[PDB]
Amino acid sequence: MKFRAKIVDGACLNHFTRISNMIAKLAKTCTLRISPDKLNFILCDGGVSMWCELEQENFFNEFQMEGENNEIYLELTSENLSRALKTAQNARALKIKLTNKHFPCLTVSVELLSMSSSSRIVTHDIPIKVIPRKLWKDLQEPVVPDPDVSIYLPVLKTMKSVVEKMKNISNHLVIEANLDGELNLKIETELVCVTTHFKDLGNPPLASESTHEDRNVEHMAEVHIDIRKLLQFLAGQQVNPTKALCNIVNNKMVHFDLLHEDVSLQYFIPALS
Amino acid sequence: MKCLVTGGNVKVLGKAVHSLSRIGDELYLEPLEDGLSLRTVNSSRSAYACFLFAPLFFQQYQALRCKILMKSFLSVFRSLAMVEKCCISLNGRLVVQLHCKFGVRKTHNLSFQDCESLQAVFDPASCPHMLRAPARVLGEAVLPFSPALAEVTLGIGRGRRVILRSYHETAKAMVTEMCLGEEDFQQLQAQEGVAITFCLKEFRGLLSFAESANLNLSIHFDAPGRPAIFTIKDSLLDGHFVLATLS
Amino acid sequence: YSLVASLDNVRNLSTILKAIHFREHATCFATKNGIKVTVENAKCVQANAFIQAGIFQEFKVQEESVTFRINLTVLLDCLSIFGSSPMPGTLTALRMCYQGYGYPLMLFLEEGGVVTVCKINTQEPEETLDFDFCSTNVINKIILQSEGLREAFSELDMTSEVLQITMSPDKPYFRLSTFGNAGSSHLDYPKDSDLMEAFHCNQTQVNRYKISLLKPSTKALVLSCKVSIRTDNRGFLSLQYMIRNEDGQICFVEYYCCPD
Amino acid sequence: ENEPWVDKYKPETQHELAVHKKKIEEVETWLKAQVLERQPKQGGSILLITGPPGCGKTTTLKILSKEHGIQVQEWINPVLPYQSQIAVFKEFLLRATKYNKLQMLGDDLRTDKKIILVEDLPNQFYRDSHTLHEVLRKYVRIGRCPLIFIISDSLSGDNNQRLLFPKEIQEECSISNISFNPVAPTIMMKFLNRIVTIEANKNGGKITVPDKTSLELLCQGCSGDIRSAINSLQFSSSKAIGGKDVSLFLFRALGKILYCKRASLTELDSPRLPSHLSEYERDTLLVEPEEVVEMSHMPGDLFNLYLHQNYIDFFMEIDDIVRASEFLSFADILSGDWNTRSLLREYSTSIATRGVMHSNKARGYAHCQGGGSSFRPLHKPQWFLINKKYRENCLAAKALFPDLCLQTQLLPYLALLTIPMRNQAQISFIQDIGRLPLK
DNA sequence: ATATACGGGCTGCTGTTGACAA
DNA sequence: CCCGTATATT
Ligand SMILES: Nc1ncnc2c1ncn2[C@@H]1O[C@H](COP(=O)(O)OP(=O)(O)OP(O)(O)=S)[C@@H](O)[C@H]1O
Known part of the structure; x- marks a missing residue:
């Protein structure tokens, strides 16, 4: 097994720093899947499953790897990687390489430049645990069933603020999606009841155009979830993308699709609080 | 004892107090014939920090030795040293009267217990090796390290270069191999492999105080087992730190 | 409705x-x-x-x-x-x-x-x-600013149990005392300063107050622009604040506390 | 005239200690064999020191350390005006184990060997009791100098010592043991006589020396504790005092109840059973069961279980056993609810104790105890393990045939099932219940 | 001939209020 | 509570 990667461009390094910070805030231990074409951030378990897809050719200028089934699975703590990348904000060159100095390690070497002619070299050895092929099927991208309702999402900051203020009253939330772009967040306690409405959300053109003659537009497929995992997902995000979509099903599933720049994010939040 | 500090010296005095608090748990106050001495010692007596203040404010001793809990002083100078004058005396109580803007006056009476005279033994002349460098370079060199580290090793590599590492004693942790160049340091009398291992927190306090006016450090390291010395010289301020090395 | x-x-x-x-x-x-x-x-x-x-x-x-x-x-x-x-x-x-x-x-x-x-x-x-607390039996009254006591009342949360307030025409014009584990801490405020808009105290008054009751005045002190202190013959304390909004109006908040 | 007599007549030399010579020699040979045979590759070790309060465990260790030139390291809890207490403790432990002092200004300089003494354990160590095991494991892995632990214990109410060191860390960590004993009457007698002689020789004025007859009384009601003896001597010499409470050592209380020290019916005016209760006449008793049970510091429902376990062997007749069993059952009945279980509990223990004591008519005839009572040890109730096994087997039967009655009705069917089925860990359970020994 | 220590058996099985470490 | 045994000392 061999893996070497080179980063020079400042913007790509900054984007990698943002992605690492986001995954560190979202999760503790993560799985990195390296393919000949792309990078995948995986978490599978509270049964939240996390998928992040990243195009390799748009970030690294030099990228070589070797694993027939050329595919690397690694399990590691995200905090170590985030701390390693934090020190390269104003750096010049970054190298990532698989090594076996003492124990299986993912060496990260960063070349710091300064007023001195000599270039400082900072080296970090993040431990890795190679998962055997037997579990390779269990980390696959989660399937997306046919959504009962697909709805465009509102601005993330206002939703995050409303949910954060809602956290104090209770630990239960209900999300309702309409066919006319109406999103309702409801909590009902024995003392206070609160409902927040969103309208004018453009409904994307659904693929099935022959299943809307008997479905009421005013009907809904609302679900109830525990407000402990939604707040993390809204708090992790720092920039509003242009592909904010929510797929809601009646029984036990809510799914989020986001896409920003060239990185895609798939969010899966189980129901039945 | 009567000291009247006026000007920007209050901030540097507070920074020195904060560094001493970061090193020790109790504060020893000693008026010498040449100024004021602040002393602190670790709980296990493996580190000793002393600040000698050259006469700069009003120094006049005798009209003579005390020790105080250090958290009280730390809180007082963290909340009350941001202030144009300071006055220190010894009644009998320790008065820390603090003149402020307009006409506000704040007084602080404290309780002290009798203690012995604390000192150490260091021989900078007897030390063969010697290293000198500006404090900013060393402070930058210790930034990549995590804030949960315990022991750091300083060495001289093959090729006249310095090296700072991370000493660890199957769930291991990260390791660091930060290296520098000889063109930044100003003076090196070293050897071909001599290295020492010491702690980090007292070093961090030293660097924190030394990263204000861009001062220059001075390390006199010896064979393993013998103590190391960190000496800071200024215009009207002297400081010496003694640590211990793993043998 | x-x-x-x-x-x-x-x-x-x-x-x-x-x-x-x-x-x-x-x-x-x-x-x-x-x-x-x-x-x-x-x-x-x-x-x-x-x-x-x-x-x-x-x-x-x-x-x-x-x-x-x-x-x-x-x-x-x-x-x-x-x-x-x-x-x-x-x-x-x-x-x-x-x-x-x-x-x-x-x-x-x-x-x-x-x-x-x-x-x-x-x-x-x-x-x-x-x-x-009608202004008929009031003996000691003072009006003063807030930025003076921002840090002062911020430097007032210790492990003490009683706060001593003394006001007199002469010497300690307005002195606060706090006795704690370490020692005393006096915070004398004189007249003829930038925060002394009116001093009209008549006779000396020294009183003790509980920290637990008087602590929540920090929130009113933070969001304010002026503070009025009043104490009567018996020793009851009346605090008057003055808050403003973005439009430019004025609203008042009053606190009443009783001595020990 | 500024320190108490406890702090004024402290033993400077070794010969001034009030501890038996063999114990001092044992501690000394352990310490000196560690010092003399200090191998460069020797790792860390832990020593455990136990004993009742006021016997002199700390002073003897300090004196023996000073005699042979050994540095000692104490541990004083820091004073608050974020870091956890355990973090500070581990940092101090690492600093003490790794490095050494610098020079000081006037010390016992020629030192390179030292030990660490920890006495003031933090509260979190008492509440958790699981951080200590990890700390000890890490120290055993990375230890250089030995660690000495000092604990103070009493006869009853020993929860802290067994909670801290529950027989497992000692077994798997190779920890030694040294136990002290209360000071003998002769040693305390001689030392008290020496002290009072020294006070008498001071002269100064005509002061009444305390009488000799009260001097053994002072030592009799202290139970081998020097410090309270000296305090009481100081109080009484101003012109009995020092009634320290007793703990009774529960296994001694059980024997006291089960042995029934009787008298020869000294002539008194105690009521007698008039005409028909002639078979219930008993000799005078010299024990109060209520005080014995209260002083052992144990719950009543546990005392009754221990008595039920241990009362059979001391009986010789069957009818007395029947009566005692009926009394124990009646004592059990009174505590079967939950709201009023703690309102009436003394009745049950009192009834059980008095029934077991009075029913023994064979033993209760004064001069009829000769001869027997061999060297016999007591035991522990066996009901706890059986009840725990019953509960775990309850759960293992329910959740796995959940579609108590299953154990009472379905489990007979299981016992008459004996046929295989599709699993691996369930055949073992089937063979468990259904294979009891039977010829 | 008399005072003192070893040997062997214990941590264990529904409700309403209160303190500690973070 | 219970019985029998090995060491310091006069
Ligand atoms: N002959 C003596 N032997 C022992 N202690 C003596 C003697 N004469 C005087 N003392 C005093 O008694 C003190 C003994 O303290 P103790 O409390 O018995 O020690 P300890 O073993 O730590 O007790 P703990 O910790 O409560 S179990 C010494 O510190 C002296 O001040």
Whole structure:
């Protein structure tokens, strides 16, 4: 097994720093899947499953790897990687390489430049645990069933603020999606009841155009979830993308699709609080 | 004892107090014939920090030795040293009267217990090796390290270069191999492999105080087992730190 | 519908309520002149506010005054549900209706097309004391600024048990003392300063007060621009604040405490 | 005239200690064999010191350390005006184990060997009791100098010592043991006589020396504790005092109840059974069961279980056993609810104790105890393990045939099932219940 | 001929209020 | 509570 990667461009390094910070805030231990074409951030378990897809050719200028089934699975703590990348904000060159100095390690070497002619070299050895092929099927991208309702999402900051203020009253939330772009967040306690409405959300053109003659537009497929995992997902995000979509099903599933720049994010939040 | 500090010296005095608090748990106050001495010692007596203040404010001793809990002083100078004058005396109580803007006056009476005279033994002349460098370079060199580290090793590599590492004693942790160049340091009398291992927190306090006016450090390291010395010289301020090395 | 009230800047009411929030419940008082929310604790300390009819744009009341008891934490959370950090140019509007006795309080909020609806059921009332501090028996009075005591009252939370206040025409004009584990800490304030707008003390007065009762004055001191201190013959302390809003109006908050 | 007699007559030399010579020699040979045979590759070790309060465990260790030139390291809890207490403790431990002092200004300089003494354990160590095991494991892995632990214990109410060191860390960590004993009457007698002689020789004025007859009384009601003896001697010499409470050592209380020390019916005016209760006449008793049970500091429902376990062997007749069993059952009945279980509990223990004591008519005839009572040890109730096994087997039967009655009705069917089925861990359970020994 | 220590058996099986470490 | 045994000392 061999893996070497080179980063020079400042913007790509900054984007990698943002992605690492986001995954560190979202999760503790993560799985990195390296393919000949792309990078995948995986978490599978509270049964939240996390998928992040990243195009390799748009970030690294030099990228070589070797694993027939050329595919690397690694399990590691995200905090170590985030701390390693934090020190390269104003750096010049970054190298990532698989090594076996003492124990299986993912060496990260960063070349710091300064007023001195000599270039400082900072080296970090993040431990890795190679998962055997037997579990390779269990980390696959989660399937997306046919959504009962697909709805465009509102601005993330206002939703995050409303949910954060809602956290104090209770630990239960209900999300309702309409066919006319109406999103309702409801909590009902024995003392206070609160409902927040969103309208004018453009409904994307659904693929099935022959299943809307008997479905009421005013009907809904609302679900109830525990407000402990939604707040993390809204708090992790720092920039509003242009592909904010929510797929809601009646029984036990809510799914989020986001896409920003060239990185895609798939969010899966189980129901039945 | 009567000291009247006026000007920007209050901030540097507070920074020195904060560094001493970061090193020790109790504060020893000693008026010498040449100024004021602040002393602190670790709980296990493996580190000793002393600040000698050259006469700069009003120094006049005798009209003579005390020790105080250090958290009280730390809180007082963290909340009350941001202030144009300071006055220190010894009644009998320790008065820390603090003149402020307009006409506000704040007084602080404290309780002290009798203690012995604390000192150490260091021989900078007897030390063969010697290293000198500006404090900013060393402070930058210790930034990549995590804030949960315990022991750091300083060495001289093959090729006249310095090296700072991370000493660890199957769930291991990260390791660091930060290296520098000889063109930044100003003076090196070293050897071909001599290295020492010491702690980090007292070093961090030293660097924190030394990263204000861009001062220059001075390390006199010896064979393993013998103590190391960190000496800071200024215009009207002297400081010496003694640590211990793993043998 | 008894009383209905509408406004377009929730922040004024929100900050007025937050300036008095240290208990869990509060009592309202709706009258042709405006609302008045009061709170009491330990049967000694009492804090009251005032929101005159000048602020409101749509205010409607029916027949006589209306009284009800409401939870303060829930109401304050509901008011600031759209984030307590708006950029200049964004505002939130609210409408409230109370349809007589035995029915809850409505609250409809709107901002930028987002509409929220909430209800707060009220179980009233309690009884309030008769802390009459009319300016007839007042002997010592002073008026002064806030930036002077920002740090001073910030440097007042220690493990002590009693705060000593002494005011005299001569020598310690206004001295605060705190006796704790370490030692004494005096904070003398003289006259003829930039924060001495009027000094009219008549006779010397030294008194002791409990830290637990007098602690929650920090919130009122932080969101203020002037403070008035009054003490009578017996030794009861009256604190008067002065808060302002973004539009440029003035509202008052009063604190009453009793000596040891 | 500024320190108490406890702090004024402290033993400077070794010969001034009030401890038996063999114990001092044992501690000394352990310490000196560690010092003399200090191998460069020797790792860390832990020593455990136990004993009742006021015997002199700390002073003897300090004196023996000073005699042979050994540095000692104490541990004083820091004073608050964020870091956890355990973090500070581990940092101090690492600093003490790794490095050495610098020079000081006037010390016992020629030192390179030292030990660490920890006495003031933090509260979190008492509440958790699981951080200590990890700390000890890490120290055993990375230890250089030995660690000495000092604990103070009493006869009853020993929860802290067994909670801290529950027989497992000692077994798997190779920890030694040294136990002290209360000071003998002769040693305390001689030392008290020496002290009072020294006070008498001071002269100064005509002061009444305390009488000799009270001097053994002072030592009799202290139970081998020097410090309270000296305090009481100081109090009484101003012109009995020092009634320290006793703990009774529960296994001694059980024997006291079960042995029934009787008298020869000294002539008194105690009521007698008039005409028909002639078979219930008993000799005078010299024990109060209520005080014995209260002083052992144990719950009543546990005392009754221990008595039920241990009362059979001391009986010789069957009818007395029947009566005692009936009394024990009646004592059990009174505590079967939950709301009023703690309102009436003394009745049950009192009834059980008095029934077991009075029913023994064979033993209760004064001069009829000769001869027997061999060297016999007591035991522990066996009901706890059986009840725990019953509960775990309850759960293992329910959740796995959940579609108590299953154990009472379905489990007979299981016992008459004996046929295989599709699993691996369930055949073992089937063979468990259904294979009891039977010829 | 008399005072003192070893040897063997214990941590264990529904509700309403209160303190500690973070 | 219970019985029998090995060491310091006069
Ligand atoms: N002959 C003596 N032997 C022992 N202690 C003596 C003697 N004469 C005087 N003392 C005093 O008694 C003190 C003994 O303290 P103790 O409390 O018995 O020690 P300890 O073993 O730590 O007790 P703990 O910790 O409560 S179990 C010494 O510190 C002296 O001040």
